[PDB]
Amino acid sequence: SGFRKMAFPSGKVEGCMVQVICGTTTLNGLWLDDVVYCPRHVICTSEDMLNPNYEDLLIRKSNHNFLVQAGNVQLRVIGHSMQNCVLKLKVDTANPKTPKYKFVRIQPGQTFSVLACYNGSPSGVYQCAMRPNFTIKGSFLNGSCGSVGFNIDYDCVSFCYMHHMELPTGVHAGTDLEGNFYGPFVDRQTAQAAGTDTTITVNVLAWLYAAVINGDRWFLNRFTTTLNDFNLVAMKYNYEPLTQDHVDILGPLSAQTGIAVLDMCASLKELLQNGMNGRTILGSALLEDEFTPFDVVRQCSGVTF
Amino acid sequence: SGFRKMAFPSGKVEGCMVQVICGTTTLNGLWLDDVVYCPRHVICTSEDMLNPNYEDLLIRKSNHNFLVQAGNVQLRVIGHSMQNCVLKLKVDTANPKTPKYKFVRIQPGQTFSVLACYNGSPSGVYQCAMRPNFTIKGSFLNGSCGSVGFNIDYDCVSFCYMHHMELPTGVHAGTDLEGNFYGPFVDRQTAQAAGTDTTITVNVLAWLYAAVINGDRWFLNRFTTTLNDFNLVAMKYNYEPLTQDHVDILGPLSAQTGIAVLDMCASLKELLQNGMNGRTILGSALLEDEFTPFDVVRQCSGV
Numbered sequence: 108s109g110f111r112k113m114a115f116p117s118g119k120v121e122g123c124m125v126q127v128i129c130g131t132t133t134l135n136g137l138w139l140d141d142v143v144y145c146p147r148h149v150i151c152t153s154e155d156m157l158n159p160n161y162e163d164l165l166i167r168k169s170n171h172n173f174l175v176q177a178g179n180v181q182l183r184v185i186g187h188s189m190q191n192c193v194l195k196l197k198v199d200t201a202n203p204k205t206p207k208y209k210f211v212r213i214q215p216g217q218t219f220s221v222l223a224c225y226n227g228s229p230s231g232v233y234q235c236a237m238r239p240n241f242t243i244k245g246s247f248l249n250g251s252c253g254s255v256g257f258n259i260d261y262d263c264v265s266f267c268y269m270h271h272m273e274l275p276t277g278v279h280a281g282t283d284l285e286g287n288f289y290g291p292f293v294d295r296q297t298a299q300a301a302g303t304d305t306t307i308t309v310n311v312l313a314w315l316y317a318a319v320i321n322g323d324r325w326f327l328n329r330f331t332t333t334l335n336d337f338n339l340v341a342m343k344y345n346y347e348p349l350t351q352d353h354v355d356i357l358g359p360l361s362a363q364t365g366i367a368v369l370d371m372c373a374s375l376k377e378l379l380q381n382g383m384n385g386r387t388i389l390g391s392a393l394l395e396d397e398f399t400p401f402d403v404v405r406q407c408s409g410v411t412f
Numbered sequence: 413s414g415f416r417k418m419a420f421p422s423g424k425v426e427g428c429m430v431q432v433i434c435g436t437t438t439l440n441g442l443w444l445d446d447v448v449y450c451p452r453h454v455i456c457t458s459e460d461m462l463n464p465n466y467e468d469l470l471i472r473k474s475n476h477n478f479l480v481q482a483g484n485v486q487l488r489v490i491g492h493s494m495q496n497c498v499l500k501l502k503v504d505t506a507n508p509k510t511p512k513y514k515f516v517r518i519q520p521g522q523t524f525s526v527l528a529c530y531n532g533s534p535s536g537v538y539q540c541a542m543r544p545n546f547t548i549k550g551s552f553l554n555g556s557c558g559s560v561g562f563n564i565d566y567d568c569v570s571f572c573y574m575h576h577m578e579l580p581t582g583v584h585a586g587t588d589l590e591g592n593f594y595g596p597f598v599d600r601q602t603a604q605a606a607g608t609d610t611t612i613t614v615n616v617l618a619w620l621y622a623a624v625i626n627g628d629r630w631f632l633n634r635f636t637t638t639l640n641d642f643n644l645v646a647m648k649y650n651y652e653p654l655t656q657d658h659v660d661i662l663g664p665l666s667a668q669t670g671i672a673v674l675d676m677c678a679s680l681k682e683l684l685q686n687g688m689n690g691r692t693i694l695g696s697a698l699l700e701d702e703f704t705p706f707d708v709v710r711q712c713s714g715v
């Protein structure tokens with residue numbers, strides 16, 4: 108038993124991380140097959156970033172301006188392309204450690220593991236969620252660009268995030284692996300802000316199911332409620348509305364604990380109305396919302412890769 | 413910027429996880445060179461665990477009783493010995509993925525990454541601290557035995573933990589890689605007690621420095637205190653006493669923020685006495701204590 112914020116094993120992704128140097132700039136790249144993916148502002152000087160013309164900057168660059176190093180090895184670039192906000196550099200060598208992989212674009216509320224990297228070396232791994240405002244509450248210093256987020260399906264690595272920049276209040280923004288930003292953000296050093304963030308309700312319900320499975324039950328109440336009554340309250344407290352699709356996703360957890368989803372919604376309703384009164388749930392004094400219903404099932408059943 | 417509970421990359425340890433089968437029982441092993449390490453209760457039946465005599469139970473096992481699978485391929489066991497609470501199985505194949513490694517016994521308050529495994533296959537990775545009562549707060553199901561905790565020093569993997577059992581309160585107990593338990597626990601299915609846990613004060617101060625570095629400053633004050641003043645306060649709240657050595661460990665953080673270790677202690681004392689007034693620090697409503705002063709320096713300066 109117990110319940111922890113848990114990241115996927117990073118081994119498969121570590122084997123794809125490389126260093127990309129263009130000029131003075133040094134950041135991280137993702138080496139899959141004979142293509143290396145990295146953020147396109149690697150071609151930028153600190154002056155360029157205030158308002159870059161990427162198309163102009165890139166055409167001026169030749170293949171030999173891009174240094175790709177995979178540990179001790181040095182990869183020879185034989186092609187460079189730009190797709191949205193990522194540079195694609197073709198290399199003379201296919202990554203022999205390329206795992207089974209997809210490129211996916213996740214919806215808000217879905218979680219993933221981030222492998223934080225600097226100079227192409229993995230530094231650490233942690234778990235995060237795509238916030239409803241399309242930011243992620245991460246941990247990134249200068250030089251972390253190109254660190255990627257991923258999910259693992261048995262042996263297939265679904266890459267969903269590449270890191271680019273930090274927004275006001277210390278939140279983070281980036282792209283899918285096709286270079287399209289999550290949210291209304293641009294890779295320019297200009298005034299941007301994320302927008303009001305909301306709590307991921309279906310994940311809070313999943314986390315409450317993790318608690319019950321682990322013995323924390325003091326919050327279960329005798330009441331119940333309709334889906335529309337719950338959502339009326341939840342939007343009052345800046346919680347995302349619960350949809351019928353969210354109810355079905357919670358089915359497995361509902362059938363394990365014999366607690367109807369709408370019964371659990373009533374417990375949550377009272378938690379937002381009467382506060383937690385200094386009490387804790389699975390050790391936390393706040394309601395946790397970065398566990399998906401799938402995360403909870405995985406951790407409580409022992410799924411492996 | 414930002415601050416997260418962060419684990420070491422688990423790749424080097426993934427290549428050392430094998431499945432160990434002995435009769436009906438299955439659990440995880442750690443394959444280093446031509447040796448596999450696993451908890452010794454892999455030799456117990458359902459009944460044996462209530463009161464095992466491991467010497468006698470092992471005497472009735474043979475090398476051919478132990479089936480080690482590494483991915484698909486089965487390994488050949490050619491020798492076995494018992495070192496305290498772990499079995500050491502010699503195999504006919506050195507692990508070609510063996511990293512540079514050492515075995516260490518960690519102190520309370522130190523942190524490490526756990527690679528949680530089932531049937532020799534990794535399930536997930538998370539960070540935890542050795543509690544002062546020599547338990548850890550983990551996530552462990554049946555079959556998780558033989559999962560290991562570890563730190564990475566550049567390229568060397570320091571193994572410090574192998575998981576054995578779960579205690580009544582849902583916390584978890586295990587051994588170092590020589591098989592000596594952390595704490596006063598035994599590998600037997602009988603009611604056991606962890607004892608009173610305390611807060612790792614020097615880690616809480618490290619977390620507060622992480623907060624100040626990340627712009628969350630509302631808890632700072634120009635108040636002061638002595639180490640004896642603070643420690644007299646801290647013990648009332650079940651906080652481990654702060655030593656001068658802890659003050660020396662916190663030095664790099666103090667110098668990076670320009671806040672004396674003891675000014676920060678005066679802020680922690682104020683926090684324990686007055687609560688948080690519903691405030692949060694780094695988005696947390698409670699004081700976090702599983703970040704060491706080294707962890708904070710690493711994450712906030714990018715090692």
Ligand SMILES: *C(=N)[C@H](C[C@@H]1CCNC1=O)NC(=O)[C@@H]1[C@@H]2[C@H](CN1C(=O)[C@@H](NC(=O)C(F)(F)F)C(C)(C)C)C2(C)C
Pocket residue numbers: 134148156247248249250251252271272273274275279293294295296297298299413
């Ligand atoms: C990658 N090398 C860094 C990683 C950043 C820096 C600090 N923390 C991180 O995650 N990325 C940047 O330096 C990018 C890079 C130019 C500016 N930038 C920023 O992250 C800046 N942010 C913004 O301009 C804002 F707020 F709009 F996001 C900075 C103020 C330096 C944090 C480019 C191309 C965006």
Ligand SMILES: *C(=N)[C@H](C[C@@H]1CCNC1=O)NC(=O)[C@@H]1[C@@H]2[C@H](CN1C(=O)[C@@H](NC(=O)C(F)(F)F)C(C)(C)C)C2(C)C
Pocket residue numbers: 108439453456461552553554555556557576577578579580584598599600601602603604
């Ligand atoms: C080995 N894979 C399991 C892992 C446990 C089971 C649930 N979570 C875990 O971390 N470990 C065991 O089953 C060990 C094994 C016999 C009993 N045991 C326990 O963990 C038991 N605990 C205790 O008896 C107590 F209270 F002392 F901790 C159990 C009640 C099954 C949790 C042996 C040899 C210790």
